[PDB]
Amino acid sequence: SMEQVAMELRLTELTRLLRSVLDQLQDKDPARIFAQPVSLKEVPDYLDHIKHPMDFATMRKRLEAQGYKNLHEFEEDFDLIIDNCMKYNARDTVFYRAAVRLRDQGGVVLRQARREVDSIG
């Protein structure tokens, strides 16, 4: 159907816009602390602590599969990156501090992404 094509065009453009948000968010992590999944080889008990791991590479796979239906889903996953880190790591660690910084800097990016998503429909 034509509707299904228009639908896919909007999903495809949502993906274009989310790709740009993801690039901007990941730019705020020059240390690449959040770039890849936490290694279950190097942290064998991680899943005892964190039930839903997340990282930027995993977000990007879902993004390119067009697996984000709206900004809220995308934001949930970003929030998992931050919140998992701030649980597993203690407050004084470079990891926890990097998550605080990423949350603070990313807040700005996501504020304007929400306006753009609403505005463009």
Q: Smallest distance from the beta carbon of 16 to ligand TWL, in angstroms?
A: 28
- 28 vs 114, which CB is nearer to ligand TWL? 28
Q: Which residues bind ligand TWL (CB under 6 A)?
A: 33-34, 38, 84-85, 88-89, 95
Q: Smallest distance from the beta carbon of 34 to ligand TWL, in angstroms?
A: 6
- 24 vs 89, which CB is nearer to ligand TWL? 89
CB 63 within 8 Å of CB 22: yes
Number of CB atoms found within 10 A of residue 102's CB? 21
Q: What angle do CA 112, 116, 80 make, to 5 degrees?
A: 60
**Pure H helices in the chain:** 2-27, 46-49, 56-64, 71-88, 94-120
- 61 vs 69, which CB is nearer to ligand TWL? 61
Q: Smallest distance from the beta carbon of 117 to ligand TWL, in angstroms?
A: 27
